[PDB]
Design goal:
The structure is a homooctamer.
Chain A: E1 5-9, H1 15-27, E2 32-36, H2 43-52, E3 60-66, H3 71-78, E4 83-88, H4 96-103, E5 112-113, H5 118-132, H6 137-153
Helix pairs in contact in A: 1-5, 2-3
Chain lengths: 159, 161, 159, 161, 159, 161, 159, 161
């Protein structure tokens, strides 16, 4: 029941994208928390969140933000837990700024980066699941079923 | 000492970059294997490697690739394990083609992508360690000590010559 | 009657683009098959499709996909037949990711790449036709007529 | 030994890149011609070369070009034969201008485009071979052997020094 | 009455952009012709047009095209007259492909390139006018008036 | 001689670029401090540095950073003082990743960004000086003289060899 | 009552973006002027504006423009005052041209650059405020309140 | 021998690129002047240079600039003469910043832009010549001969070593 994955985002405007990560974790029945934590507007909230994540039982953190998307990187700076980053599509640069601001982390503090947008949000959740599956047999089976259904469901020809 | 992490790359030319992932895993005492698997030249080798990764005991796969960097993505298509991708810098486009070809995976098949080049390789190994640390207390302690040391080793001022 | 060209695409979402390749081949009366084969979601389906293409009588394969568009490249990895790639326009990066993921193939395994989007889908079909025309006199004549009509139909002044 | 493939480039500076296409065609025993045709400096030469390519027996044209890489596209405008384009790396933009100027052909006039640089030149020749192999059993066998050898020659592990 | 400026474009789809060049030349009363000439679809039409431009009395050629926009460059290849290029905004790459395909002309054959889109079409016409003004006193005066009105008309504060 | 400007950078490797900011401030007789603060390796050091900047007497902060250049932005999140950011050129992407990661701050937390590299560092210092000049007549005069000299020092023609 | 900040923009079309800078300064009660000054269409107006800015009592200039956005740079060329630049989002290149045309100022003449678009306009105003706050205690307090409210107002979870 | 073309650049560092424009004008016997005018460091010098260009007899202005390449555009704002812009390659962004900062002029103030670097400088001079050739028969003949020679000088095949 206690969250094992924390989904954080820079603002309400990132929800349209991050809701896909939330839906996926719920689909696979992975207990999680979904919050808004801004590295730029609420820096101390982020420091505390990231600093205490492990103690609180979190195993993986999924962070999404757009523009100068420093959220994933700063979260990883305070936690030893794996941090996965989702580049949110920005209005002008279509997430290219978001992507580079997240993936180009200097050696020493990693952030596993996913694709720009909804696909990336969904994949961060799936990646977090594949991580949890390493030590949770039941979930591992559900993840296998999920991947198997994805594969079997692809049509043979277009409509 | 059975490998729990698998480092794969498309060619010998990728080693200059991927060696940083290898070095870090060894530093943290993480048993691993290092191989060359070409998505384009040895597709069936990749298929077999990826399909059996889990049954062979691997927990995380770190794949490096340049240009139409397909290795990480194709590996993830066959394994349920988490796959981390390292974009190898390319001659003309400086790794931008490698980066986009790896990170832009469609929803459903993830690849945790790291920075272009050496930094990315080192971080892929660090990310892999943080994943394994979740269920390995001894490793978790070693990683904690490693992160703590990194922070304490940062100088307070530059050597202004 | 047996297909000599195979048109494959990563998903239904690529159809809006790949239908242009289908229409062109039909226009020139080139027998072909149009299927959905995902390198990421249905890897074994792709391996089998590409591996057996030649045996089945296919002469050219046209593959379209977007984002990390590895479909054309992986298809070429398993077949000796010429593979033509169509970069599908992606939501965020407008097909720049699709283009680079397809054209930047390392030496040893080629993929003839066409333009991003519908133009590219149409041109892949035309290129496949120009290839088949080398050993099919009847088709060669129809292709000549097609190119001649294209040229003669261009207006002299804008409306 | 009449040429069945024509390799053309805009200038001598392109040879460093296009020589890889030449080498591969020769390796596979594919009769071909190699010439310099400037779309911008010798437009009429290009017009004549492209118009008569088919009647001269050519089956495939491989054109290399840099910067406002117009050669492949203009050649295709005049010939019904399949034209393959090789983006030659440029000084400032590293071939991105060459790539976009070649691959972005409007619907109706195709140019099968390969990777920027040497890899693209080699692949243009390989693609040309796969095209000719469709109606040349002997060549098809040589290409099959070449691909098979490439796959078998990939090492299983890197020389970790 | 005889045209001194020729406006050519790759296709009807470029008209929405090139009409701005036409309107400007008409505004300044510069006799001109507006045609569709495709370097890819009507290469011989282009060769003849460019080759005979000077003989026909043309002083400047304004060429617009999108994508692999080779039109301006190829026109300049056949004429000694100044050729001005207008990069038409493409669907996917927003004219970045059009711009690079036009401006990056190798030394030896120039093309004066203007901005992507309508602004570029308008400026090609203005540039062509500034060229003609060097030997046409009446036009030079009208161009001076045009530039003076542009400058004087800019509001002092936004509405 | 208490510092009124603080120059911070993520690592020693940034010094080659940031030294230009230091040199200019000294040239204009602007008391300042120069330190290394890593946003990613020493997050708490940055938090403390930024929070107390104003109470310590600092008026302007100049932060340099490369790659996922987070330093300028994170510093601004904690201080009410104006923060100027210098994008440090990166190996692969030539500072484009540094630039976008710094300039694209969301509304609400500003970072006055300068050009990539040495020019940006020099200009960050010049911008800082123009800010301080607003309430320091002596400095305003020195800056005026500096700008005037720059303009008067431009040659009228190139040394055409 | 006399303006201490001058907001200038290349044209009326930049107002949709620059109005955000105007609103912010008004919110913090910072006396300012909002004008249209084009570096390309009204160069002498710009020279005079920038040249006399300091004499007129202005402390900071916020300049916004799109495309070949040389406005901030040229304004800084004539004034010793700090100039902040706002890259306006352009139609084709989404402000990438605007951004590079402003931020890449050679050493010797600075322009503090903000993000592309509305965010950048808002931040230029906030940056200008943080500058004025250094010598205006009352404003400094209002700026502290503004930043504090921004931070406290961020929701804890998405709706 | 009064100048009819004016070549201006922002600094001595631009000369390496702009010298190609100078050389070509001289080759074609086109009287011209070559000066350094900084848009950012000597704004009033530029204002005066541009305003009086026409009255001084100049017919075409060729301006080179790098980075926030403002020179060509600002010059055009003050002169009714046609202005040609040469993007000078920049260190980090390889002239892309120079290119966009010059070519993207808003409707109403044109700048005929050439390629990034040396090729652009040479072509700016060639374009200037083609403009002057419209009302100078002698020059028109020299340009015709120059173009004809260029075409005739292109080799038919590469030196395949």
């Amino acid at each position: 029941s206690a969250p094992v994955v924390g989904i954080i985002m820079g603002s309400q405007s990132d929800w349209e994208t991050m809701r896909h990560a939330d839906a996926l974790l719920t689909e696979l029945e992975i207990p999680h928390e979904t919050l808004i934590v801004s590295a730029h507007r609420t820096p101390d909230r982020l420091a505390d969140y990231a600093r205490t994540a492990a103690e609180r039982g979190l195993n993986v953190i999924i962070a999404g933000a757009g523009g100068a998307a420093n959220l994933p990187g700063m979260c990883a700076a305070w936690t030893r837990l794996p941090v996965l980053g989702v580049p949110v599509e920005s209005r002008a640069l279509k997430g290219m700024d978001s992507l580079l601001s997240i993936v180009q982390m200097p050696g020493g503090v990693p952030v596993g980066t996913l694709a720009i947008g909804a696909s990336g949000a969904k994949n961060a959740a799936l990646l977090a699941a594949s991580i949890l599956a390493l030590y949770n047999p039941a979930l591992a089976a559900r993840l296998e079923t999920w991947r198997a259904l994805q594969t079997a469901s692809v049509p043979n020809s277009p409509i």
